[PDB]
């Protein structure tokens, strides 16, 4: 890994760390998951944090988050991870991410995105010309640089 990737993950981290205190609490993780359409319980949230809570302080700090994201998985594992991520963006589950779905998820997470911005994103990613983003098209954007 390198600086650019670290800075990128730090921004990803900020989507969870709503108060900017440098740690992700179960409440913050819950807020993000609920914005994605999930409904995790307190127990489930504590278990998730416990998976990477090396210092036992009950929260995920950036070093812990970075370690989680830097971990290299097998191709098979990576493929299933990407598919799971795709399903989160593909709100209606029709196998395609629309501009409406993409903007909604991104905005709910904490990202600022205009219609023209999302239009451009979909356009660039749309390889087959159907106006939407399917799984493999999604993989290309995720792996791009």
């Amino acid at each position: 890994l390198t600086d650019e990737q670290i800075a990128e993950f730090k921004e990803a981290f900020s989507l969870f760390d709503k108060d900017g205190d440098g740690t992700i609490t179960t409440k913050e993780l819950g807020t993000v998951m609920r914005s994605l359409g999930q409904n995790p319980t307190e127990a489930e949230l504590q278990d998730m944090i416990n998976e990477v809570d090396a210092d036992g302080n009950g929260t995920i700090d950036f070093p812990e988050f970075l370690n989680l994201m830097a971990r290299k998985m097998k191709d098979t594992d990576s493929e299933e991870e990407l598919k799971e991520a795709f399903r989160v963006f593909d709100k209606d589950g029709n196998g395609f991410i629309s501009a409406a779905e993409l903007r909604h998820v991104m905005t709910n997470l904490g990202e600022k995105l205009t219609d023209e911005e999302v239009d451009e994103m979909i356009r660039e990613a749309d390889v087959d010309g159907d106006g939407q983003v399917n799984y493999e098209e999604f993989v290309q954007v995720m792996m791009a640089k």
């Binding site: 989507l15 994605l36 990202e111």
Partner: peptide, 19 residues
Amino acid sequence: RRKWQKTGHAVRAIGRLSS
């Protein structure tokens, strides 16, 4: 700048933790 990828990282993070 790389907004989509950034959100992608966050989504994948939740996946990793759920696994």
